[PDB]
Write a protein that binds this ligand. Sequence first.
Ligand SMILES: *[C@@H](O)[C@H](C[C@@H]1CCNC1=O)NC(=O)[C@H](CC(C)C)NC(=O)OC[C@H]1C[C@@H]1C1CCC(F)(F)CC1
Ligand SMILES: *[C@@H](O)[C@H](C[C@@H]1CCNC1=O)NC(=O)[C@H](CC(C)C)NC(=O)OC[C@H]1C[C@@H]1C1CCC(F)(F)CC1
Lengths: 303, 303
Amino acid sequence: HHSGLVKMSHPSGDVEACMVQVTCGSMTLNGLWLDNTVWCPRHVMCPADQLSDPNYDALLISMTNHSFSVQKHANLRVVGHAMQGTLLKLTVDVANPSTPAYTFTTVKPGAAFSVLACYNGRPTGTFTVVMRPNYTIKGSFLCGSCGSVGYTKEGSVINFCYMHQMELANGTHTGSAFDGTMYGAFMDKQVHQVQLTDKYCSVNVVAWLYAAILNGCAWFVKPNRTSVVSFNEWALANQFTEFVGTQSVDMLAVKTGVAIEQLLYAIQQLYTGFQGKQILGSTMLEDEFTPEDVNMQIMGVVM
Amino acid sequence: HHSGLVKMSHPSGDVEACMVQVTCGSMTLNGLWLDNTVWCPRHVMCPADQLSDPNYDALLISMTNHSFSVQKHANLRVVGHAMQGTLLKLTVDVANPSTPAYTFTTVKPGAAFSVLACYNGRPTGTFTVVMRPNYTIKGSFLCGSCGSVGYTKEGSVINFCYMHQMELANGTHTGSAFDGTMYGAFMDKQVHQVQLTDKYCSVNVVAWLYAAILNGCAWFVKPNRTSVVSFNEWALANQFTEFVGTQSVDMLAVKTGVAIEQLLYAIQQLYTGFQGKQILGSTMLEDEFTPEDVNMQIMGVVM
Ligand SMILES: *[C@@H](O)[C@H](C[C@@H]1CCNC1=O)NC(=O)[C@H](CC(C)C)NC(=O)OC[C@H]1C[C@@H]1C1CCC(F)(F)CC1
Ligand SMILES: *[C@@H](O)[C@H](C[C@@H]1CCNC1=O)NC(=O)[C@H](CC(C)C)NC(=O)OC[C@H]1C[C@@H]1C1CCC(F)(F)CC1
């Protein structure tokens, strides 16, 4: 009756030890301290009368090293400063003694990551989200949360993928990769911005339907099959992502004995209606769990 | 369109530094190391041929101090051992140098807490759950997760409320308070056990309907009111908890200008059907968010 699925985040201790507070006299937000570097959103340089159309190149030239105040909850003297896209790269006199093994990587639509929400450099909560097909996330962020970071963990290595920047008109959120790009077409300017349509993440729905089978729920499984190619043509007219299978999904097909194409056909039928039935206690398709989530939490398999 | 509500856990770093591995030669599970004490489930003493009907008093007498192996990922020499209800209280030679300020407290149905899931003493994930009215939680726990701990945080103080013990036939979970009692009527014996009916947590549904209003969603609000007394009589015949208002809920009534009794009436009407409409993207009543969750994540208010 219970799927055994929860929104599961990584333990956050490693990342908590990397969070600092950064201020410029106007805004206060959070930075990520690794080795001798502190990363933070560049709109820390903005006075609040210019958040709608800043000239960041000019604001940056106007700063010097002691323009930036970096504190831990210590004071970290800034000895170098630079701008990469929508992030600042501050250089500090002290190497973080608790720097974890880490990489920077970009997360793809449908993938889950863990977020450490911070205010004034103080971590206050953790949660997990999936990158939506329109490069937003359905987060929980208030004023002062910018600089909060998202990350995945492979083994002992932390793969930082997100630095929080802003909220959109519809309540969702977006931010930067650590190459300084914003996800999607977004700009770090407090103005109305076009928003791309969101879509169902077809791979994650398939994962969820497998999770239902692994919990004894399979009324929706019929011998009928939709091929991947046919499903993807259907997908395009129904605001579903195109499906791309993975080894993680294949393992789920092996364990249950149910082929991907059976579940692609089931999504097509379920999209038009659950006929009053429930799947894992839901009457709507669920796309916030990944194949890796289902393999890990139900089957006991990382990879 | 997006509620700004996520399942939000506490940052887990403080508790990660307290987790150890405990073994007796049969089972390996997790313990919680605070000052000179290590807490762990008592069925670490069981050989796997006796998990269905152990004699814990006799197993305990049969143990000595070096029967228990406690390791951190160190070795902590056990110098004392005792049993409190369904937990063991091991005394070790070394005080945990990172013991947080803490209390032990019991969590009540409807209240949310954070869980650190651990295997072999290694923290592997964090998530948050509400204690169901039948004293289970809808967790994510596999073999070797016993000893994983649940906790709330008031200020800097960690209020430990849960040590994981077992899974039930229906996929939900339960465990001990740190006074050694199991929640509800449950026993730490691997046998079939009666399960109490679960119910909607009426206070948390009200919280959720307030969260909808705070996000511009209020079609369900009518001038009609159901008094608390009348709602609670209704509650008893419909598998809802009886409603008990709090200051947290009152603040939500103040902010929105919508009285509790309007929402009690709305639950009664919504219970019988959403008439095809959605609330915060859901066609079912939602009871996994507390008034404190809505105050914190949407309104910015702790208390
Ligand atoms: C961190 O500094 C801060 C986090 C935001 C604040 C509230 N929730 C969050 O996630 N970031 C900002 O305040 C940024 C700063 C810019 C220079 C990038 N701005 C916003 O997030 O603005 C809030 C948008 C929802 C407001 C609004 C924007 C104009 C509009 F389009 F017309 C209507 C929507
Ligand atoms: C930690 O040691 C372990 C965590 C469990 C394992 C799987 N998921 C979890 O949360 N705890 C146990 O294995 C306990 C040990 C007892 C001495 C308390 N036992 C169980 O959790 O048993 C699993 C129950 C689901 C099994 C079953 C029980 C008999 C039944 F009722 F007939 C049918 C249901």
